[PDB]
């Protein structure tokens, strides 16, 4: 996260880190307390599936304060119309081998229905952008957890501040044009949560842009919306051997 | 009422039904009060609630 500010210990208690062999590689946002959601570009490059840990609970990387829990991850579900090393449709979802424990510091994310979040979450023009990423443009990574405050744009308008991939249904741009403040490597997967009256949901995933904090440019969204049935769907279905699934979309 | 509108006077979630009618609901974890529109916890970790600023306002 570039230009934002550290999120005071339990106040984004649904952040996750996703580790492979102990490395961070991405965030990811707890919707219940076995499912977790991220983007399915940080897969891309996996080779053992069975590496992969998803920590909730965490804020400080440089110690150990107890409040942290560590699984596995058992699946990884990406719809088919993914395509590796491409922007479009950018979302996984990872079943955890045991359930989270709910606490102060481990909470899930509201998953909205999509009437609500069309009708309404998406006219939220603020929401927040969280992560562990870099806090600079070829900068060092954070160790404490970063939030950003970020207005969203509809898509025209985006594509007319803008100045390389589509932004497609799938999408939505966030952020400011400035160089100022966005989300970074090492926050993809992470959440962009939207409060409406007292509660959060869920309404984007980190996903890409052109470089971090770039100047002319705005950050790049999954736009979760357009998955709840997809997801809704997946969260009832019983477990299949073997991480990686591959599952139809819509 | 309509749920296109000011999300239809609900707190969460909202259906148009056949007729000027409108039910709103509420996520797993809340229940929906006789204004049958708000919504309230039922349980102790909620989702989207964060207990340190619920606790530091109760
Ligand atoms: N917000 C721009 C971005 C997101 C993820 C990775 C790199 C850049
Ligand atoms: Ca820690
Ligand atoms: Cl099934
Ligand atoms: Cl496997």
Redesign the pocket.
Known sequence: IVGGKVCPKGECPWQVLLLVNGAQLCGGTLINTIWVVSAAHCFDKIKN??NLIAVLGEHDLSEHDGDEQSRRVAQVIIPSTYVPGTTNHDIALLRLHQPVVLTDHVVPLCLPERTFSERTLAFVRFSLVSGWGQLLDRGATALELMVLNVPRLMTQDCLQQSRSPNITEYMFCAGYSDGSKDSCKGDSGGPHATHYRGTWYLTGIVSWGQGCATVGHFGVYTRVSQYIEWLQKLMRSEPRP???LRAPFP | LICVNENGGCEQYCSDHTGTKRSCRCHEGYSLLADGVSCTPTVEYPCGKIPILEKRNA
């Open positions: 599936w069975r073997g991480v990686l």
